[PDB]
Amino acid sequence: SDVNITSKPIEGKGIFSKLKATLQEMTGKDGSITKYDESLTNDIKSLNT
């Protein structure tokens, strides 16, 4: 038959990819607490106004 046998992966991937993957979103510009970081700034901004 017309058969199609794909790449059939089984991923040996480690903590450091995972660790860093979390870090850039957790730590990065768009960290949820980073987002709070602007919030604090906004809290500062709103309060000064």
Binding site: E25, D30, S32, K35, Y36, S39, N42, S46
Partner: protein, 50 residues
């Protein structure tokens, strides 16, 4: 009439003073409430983080 005219006005101002004070309470309370809708909008955004 002048006395009546005057002493009436005195109450009128005092009355407006009674209104002005309460309005301060309401303005300030409202001035605070806007910030609360910044709060909700920002907070849901944090909640909206994927």
């Amino acid at each position: 009439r002048l006395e009546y005219e005057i002493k009436t006005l005195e109450q009128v101002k005092e009355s407006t003073s009674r209104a002005q004070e309460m309005t301060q309470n309401s303005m300030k309370a409202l001035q605070d409430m806007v910030k609360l809708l910044e709060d909700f909008k920002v907070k849901v955004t944090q909640a909206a983080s994927d």
